[PDB]
Ligand binder design. Sequence first.
Ligand SMILES: *[C@@H]1O[C@H](CO)[C@@H](O[C@@H]2O[C@H](CO)[C@@H](O[C@@H]3O[C@H](CO)[C@@H](O)[C@H](O)[C@@H]3O)[C@H](O)[C@H]2NC(C)=O)[C@H](O)[C@H]1NC(C)=O
Ligand SMILES: *[C@@H]1O[C@H](CO)[C@@H](O[C@@H]2O[C@H](CO)[C@@H](O)[C@H](O)[C@H]2NC(C)=O)[C@H](O)[C@H]1NC(C)=O
Ligand SMILES: *[C@@H]1O[C@H](CO)[C@@H](O[C@@H]2O[C@H](CO)[C@@H](O)[C@H](O)[C@H]2NC(C)=O)[C@H](O)[C@H]1NC(C)=O
Ligand code: NAG
Ligand code: NAG
Ligand code: NAG
Ligand code: NAG
Lengths: 322, 195, 183
Amino acid sequence: DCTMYICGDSTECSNLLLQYGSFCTQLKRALTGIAVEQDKNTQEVFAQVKQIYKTPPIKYFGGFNFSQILPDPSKPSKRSFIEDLLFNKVTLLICAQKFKGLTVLPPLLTDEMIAQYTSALLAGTITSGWTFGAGAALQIPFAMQMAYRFNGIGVTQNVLYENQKLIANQFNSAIGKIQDSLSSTASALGKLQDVVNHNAQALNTLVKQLSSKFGAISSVLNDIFSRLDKVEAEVQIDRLITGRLQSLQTYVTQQLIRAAEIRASANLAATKMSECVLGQSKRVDFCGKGYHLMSFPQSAPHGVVFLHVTYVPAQEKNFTTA
Amino acid sequence: KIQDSLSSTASALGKLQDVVNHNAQALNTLVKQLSSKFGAISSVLNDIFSRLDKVEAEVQIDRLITGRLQSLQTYVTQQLIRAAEIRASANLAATKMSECVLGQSKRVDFCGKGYHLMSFPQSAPHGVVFLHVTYVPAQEKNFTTAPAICHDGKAHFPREGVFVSNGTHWFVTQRNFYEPQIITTDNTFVSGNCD
Amino acid sequence: NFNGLKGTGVLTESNKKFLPFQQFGRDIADTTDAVRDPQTLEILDITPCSFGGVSVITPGTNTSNQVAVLYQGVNCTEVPVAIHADQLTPTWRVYSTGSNVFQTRAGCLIGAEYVNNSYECDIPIGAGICASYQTSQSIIAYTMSLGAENSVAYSNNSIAIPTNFTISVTTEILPVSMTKTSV
Ligand SMILES: *[C@@H]1O[C@H](CO)[C@@H](O[C@@H]2O[C@H](CO)[C@@H](O[C@@H]3O[C@H](CO)[C@@H](O)[C@H](O)[C@@H]3O)[C@H](O)[C@H]2NC(C)=O)[C@H](O)[C@H]1NC(C)=O
Ligand SMILES: *[C@@H]1O[C@H](CO)[C@@H](O[C@@H]2O[C@H](CO)[C@@H](O)[C@H](O)[C@H]2NC(C)=O)[C@H](O)[C@H]1NC(C)=O
Ligand SMILES: *[C@@H]1O[C@H](CO)[C@@H](O[C@@H]2O[C@H](CO)[C@@H](O)[C@H](O)[C@H]2NC(C)=O)[C@H](O)[C@H]1NC(C)=O
Ligand SMILES: *[C@@H]1O[C@H](CO)[C@@H](O)[C@H](O)[C@H]1NC(C)=O
Ligand SMILES: *[C@@H]1O[C@H](CO)[C@@H](O)[C@H](O)[C@H]1NC(C)=O
Ligand SMILES: *[C@@H]1O[C@H](CO)[C@@H](O)[C@H](O)[C@H]1NC(C)=O
Ligand SMILES: *[C@@H]1O[C@H](CO)[C@@H](O)[C@H](O)[C@H]1NC(C)=O
């Protein structure tokens, strides 16, 4: 807020603020543009589907076990088993001292709505392949669908059927290793941790900046009137308004830099979900490390987590060629 | 229908209209922002020199130079921000022309919604407009499929396509268009027994 | 003017635990937030009244002349505290204990009736609430709809194959440059 931050609840300063005038209004339109954008960054990623699919009750996908990523109806929140580990690993009177016009607006999409978009992506990518992202969704057995993911890598489809049981075990084993890996350490979620750390630290310096004299006689506005003659007191009070207006300016400029960086990262998650999730990518080292097969999305606070499934050649033998 | 879709609603071109609406809004604030006083006697620049002598006139004139010198710096900084996000959009339109227009794109949902065929560029004031042409499957049916076929105690796999059956006997088709074909040694390759 | 403390703000009864010679109350921003009243051992915390951001929901001026008011992050029974004159700069008292009040996660808005169907979002509110001007015309507030529900009949021996195609042409607009300026 313009008026309440610098000399809130003091009508003898509010009229002085009209001297500068349209300086603070430029700040409101700058901060309001950031807030509207944050509601579009989330829309571009999770809202790439025109339908809300849901998985059938039967959970026999040819031996593959998807129970760790599909939603759990037992929990009050319809979040999968993996998604619960993420919500308890990101740590966010602190907001009670914000009577200076500083507020934290709520996001347009509640966190129980984003989990519905993510559950639609998963339930449509295991029963219909990639065909739901380019037209009408067409069903296909999961056992046969994985045969056209090998066929795109360069390996014939007669190797999956002859090794279907072994491949299912390796997929199931690696999907349970992620659960323990996340709960083992705490530095894996670092990318989302400093996003909220930077915003919390930026506001803190803003609040502490109004206790500085700015070289004047006194920081508090009331005693300046009672300790200086009225003929020259108006010089000192505007000499203090400049600091509280420049300080608010540096905060806004810093946010404009951060918002562009997040915008460039929200445009990369939209591509990573269009190409890796809704199809198979031939770009190397884009959707993982190796030959790409498929991916699964998960929701995290102020972010998104992918689960790339790749193909890696095992032990080799020398040969002679012509 | 492209001509009539644009000519009906005028809100389609809002991506280019707000680019020119923002630049005009920034200059208007800059002009209206020199009517402030910054704690001086008056905003008129030569009224200070015609009412005060040289010894306290410099206190007032300096209070006005730095005030006006700070509204220019703010204006320049915002332009550096805006120019760095128009450039991030001119590097996206320079890629759509190199890949969607000058070739056929396999990246999905990059040059349209569907299977990309070919695109055409058109020019708009302070922008570019692409006309993507895509391919979308129409009504479909559903059949019964089988991973392989055993004939002489040996499995058979499709070279390119799927196995389907219309109820009585089987066929082999494409994956993106129902064109049934008869099973033949040409269509299939053999690998191992069928147990 | 509590022993040389000057400011503005309502005085409320507080129960913080001071110490034998602790008079002032200092907050994070180094501003007074508690004072020991002279002639008494009572402690009072200094805070403004129920305050925050006031937002106005409206269609175009030409379409209609009706508005709805949303108070951000306030208990919906703490808004009618200031229904008086010469107490507030905003004296529009018919909007405080007025029309159908509905409480959201971002405060309660007054002047819009909550329907319990679901459409697309027209004017965003927050936490999954949107508002629109439908029909007899009045402003309504509903919950967003994510889209049409669907289900795929999955099976382990069933496949679907298209038998026809359609061709569509789509547009896409991108800015490439802006105006050049010299000063
Ligand atoms: C599934 O596809 C098969 C193969 O097309 C269908 O069987 C076919 O049915 C037609 C209709 O009777 C047969 O055509 C007949 O051919 C004889 C040949 O002399 C002719 O004299 C008749 O007048 C008639 O044209 C065709 O032979 C037959 N295919 C085979 C291999 O025998 C079948 O009806 C389809 N099932 C469904 C449910 O659509
Ligand atoms: C998929 O894997 C999960 C483990 O992540 C299996 O759940 C376990 O099942 C065994 C035997 O049924 C129990 O002893 C464990 O207590 C279960 N663990 C958990 C965390 O639920 C699940 O059974 C597997 N899917 C199928 C179809 O068997
Ligand atoms: C595939 O769809 C096209 C239209 O999308 C069908 O073409 C139409 O056929 C009817 C049949 O009398 C004509 O009246 C229309 O004029 C045709 N449309 C156009 C644009 O020419 C076509 O018949 C369909 N094919 C199949 C096998 O169903
Ligand atoms: C009046 O407002 C409506 C939208 O509320 C708009 O469609 C119409 O063009 C406006 N008329 C004017 C600005 O003359
Ligand atoms: C508002 O206050 C009432 C009175 O205690 C309470 O029942 C209600 O839950 C409050 N609304 C909130 C906390 O959103
Ligand atoms: C929907 O209508 C009103 C909306 O407030 C509500 O009180 C009522 O119980 C609801 N009825 C049904 C059938 O959902
Ligand atoms: C498909 O799954 C059902 C349920 O397990 C099973 O009874 C049936 O035999 C399966 N079909 C094939 C072809 O394996």
